[model samples]
Target chain A: VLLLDVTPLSLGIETMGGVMTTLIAKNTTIPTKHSQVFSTAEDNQSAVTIHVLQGERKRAADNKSLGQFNLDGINPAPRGMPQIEVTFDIDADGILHVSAKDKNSGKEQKITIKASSGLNEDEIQKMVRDAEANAEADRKFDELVQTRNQGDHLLHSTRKQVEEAGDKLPADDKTAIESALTALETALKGEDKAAIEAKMQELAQVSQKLMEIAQQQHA
Target chain B: VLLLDVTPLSLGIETMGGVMTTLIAKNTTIPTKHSQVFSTAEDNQSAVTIHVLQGERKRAADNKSLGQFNLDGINPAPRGMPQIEVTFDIDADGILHVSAKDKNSGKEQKITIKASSGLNEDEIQKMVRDAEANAEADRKFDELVQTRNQGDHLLHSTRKQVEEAGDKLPADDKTAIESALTALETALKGEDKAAIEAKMQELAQVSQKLMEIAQQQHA
Candidate 1:
């Protein structure tokens, strides 16, 4: 099955004054080919010049020319008598490759052109790799911060509960409660999950004692 | 600006002999068009038959074809002499329409193919509209629930504080303290913002009286 294909940027023939006239524009899909046959414009032309350009411009002078190549050994016929077949095939990566052949002589020629004007293949690849690496680093940092924030919010709410249940408790119980609060705060500042769990267990024990005392006073 | 386009289903095409062949396959972009040209299969054929199908099948036998049409009046040509171009244009709403044209003669025909085998356009539009409306209602309901919950939690915590400071308040402040508790509960249950705000103001007035009693007792 054909999964995906990248279209070529543009396809067109070059005019006389180093100008390229586009036929099919860019960002079109690949592994696809198109053929356009044209007659020689000059009479008794020994070789027909084929200039391939890639861009979306309508005017001949506004696009980039891949390169100009001549079809040697033509029929040496009058103008519009000899026909040259130009075929453009784009690969899956949007790369443009061209082939030309003479219908009468059956002589064929092929060439691969670099279509990108701003950045070459190597430069674009390197920039993408760097961006991906930076994004991965940022994601890791965000995860760590989120985990710490969750623990901090839990500790803050729990401490508020403990402080509201005041100093009338036993000295030993009070010491235990204070110790648990300190441990929870310390664990939040560090990344050790084991330390956080241990501190949470201690806080739960202190909370049970405090709850019992409050119930006794109410009774 | 480009808006989000939702394509909840896949689409394919049908072929000859009542077979379903996928031409413009699914999960593709919206507002896209695909064209395929056909020719007369028999020589000296005065009219050509064209069958248009839509579905996701490899062969024409498995797919559902919406309709079929034949082009009349040929220029007395041999087999494969007339060319018929079939263009399928799918809009942003996942609606499919087909158009046929003779490239040689420049004659054209069109039809709107319905995907009755799948969801109708009206059904899809209704589903999207209902989802958006339900999401908005749910959002408002959630905010109201959250605000009421916060008020309940605050009142519960403040009651605990007043009980702990009971010995520090005057006897006359007892009525004021009870009124504050009732005002807090009323504010928590009130739906409208204005009604809740009025209840909150009553609670604040009662709280101020209780604070004055505490200051007098301490002095």
Candidate 2:
């Protein structure tokens, strides 16, 4: 599998909506080819600009466009009558050749992919190493986001808990919880991560105590 | 303009360090050609992978595209010994021709851009119309990126306003805005476009009220 080659981006051409319609998808096994039919909707259209793009974004505006070229030889006729066959030949080494030919006139415009991502055997090995180097740090960042999100929810709940308990809890315990919540208010303002983490921890403790107080009062 | 033709992706061959050295860059206007010198790092290197690619990602293996080819005629020599001259001819109509030749032995390998991305004249005409409709999407997307940045800045500061309201906030009012903030949290987690719009809206509303509540609490 490490030795296998695949497409780096989706191979697609523009449609009426100015978006790409993919023919050969990205990451399909190599040593393959595909052909599809497309037609113009306007009458007597002599030329077309087929925009080729690569990427997964649904909109062409969001994807990397390879280029747009004018295929100038179609016979002018009523819309949707002349069909052009678009063909793609993608090789195991990742080379691509695309051709456009009109079914009626047989006029053709073709290109072999010049710049696309086909890593030489050597480049693949380096990319593997690069992916590994970045993975650990990516994990840490993911966890950090989770921590901050949970902390915010906890703080929100803590505020609500104190408000709900207005006079139900003992004054001393209420005061303590209020004091800590105020500290939480202060800690969240700073730029320091560790300080914020500690504050999150503080918030959790108050929340736990508030739960106990609520349960005792109910009983 | 020298018939400038850019690459759809970066085109490069593999040398060492498992990375691609792009020769033909994407977006270069054409009827253009580029010639470069490459050498085998090891002794007696007989073959090289002339990998072609398309896509904007930095890694060669991660790109999509023209596949790799075997340059089998390099002379038997020690590492860093032989220089191979590689040339690319990119035509105006998307045709591509590439060749690799050893300076000493003069043996060479080559091909014309046989297949690339091509849609028919009828297709191109439709693509042009589609592209015209999207002139708006381009600008709209630009605005979206800017708006998201503003949202990020606003969100960061919002962690602020409510944080400062520590000591004495009107429970009646602060609780109201706090409820809005909690709703904001929920909104930020779902369907992005509409969700963020609402989140930003809530942020603004909560923000205005936070200022009002602050003045009240001060009194």
Cα RMSD (angstroms) for every candidate in the order listed: 34.1, 27.5
Residue range B1-219, candidate 2, lDDT tens digits: 555545544455544533445666645566677666565644356787787654433334544556567778654533333446688787777687889876555678886665354333464455455545654454344334434433443453344345556554566666765666676566545536456555565545445445444334323
Maximum-TM-score candidate: 1
What TM-score number comes out for model 2?
0.28
The lowest-lDDT stretch of 10 consecutive residues in candidate 1 chain A is A138-147
* lDDT for model 2: 0.56
Model 1 residue B73 lDDT score: 60
The 10 consecutive residues of candidate 1 chain B with the worst lDDT sum are B210-219
Q: DockQ of each candidate's interface versus the true one? A: 0.01, 0.01
* Per-residue lDDT of B203 in model 2: 49
Pick the lDDT winner. 2
Q: Residue by residue across A27-88, what tens digits does model 1's lDDT show?
A: 44556676555555544566877777655443344445667777887654333334456777
lDDT of each: 0.54, 0.56
Error of 2 at A99 (Å): 0.7
lDDT, candidate 2, A1-219, per-residue tens: 667676755678877544557867756678878666565644456777777766554445545566666677665433333456677787766677788876545578987776454344455455445545655443344334433444444455455446646676677677766776777667655545456556654444444445554334333
Off by over 4 Å in 1: A1-172, A190-198, A215-219, B1-130, B170-174, B205-219
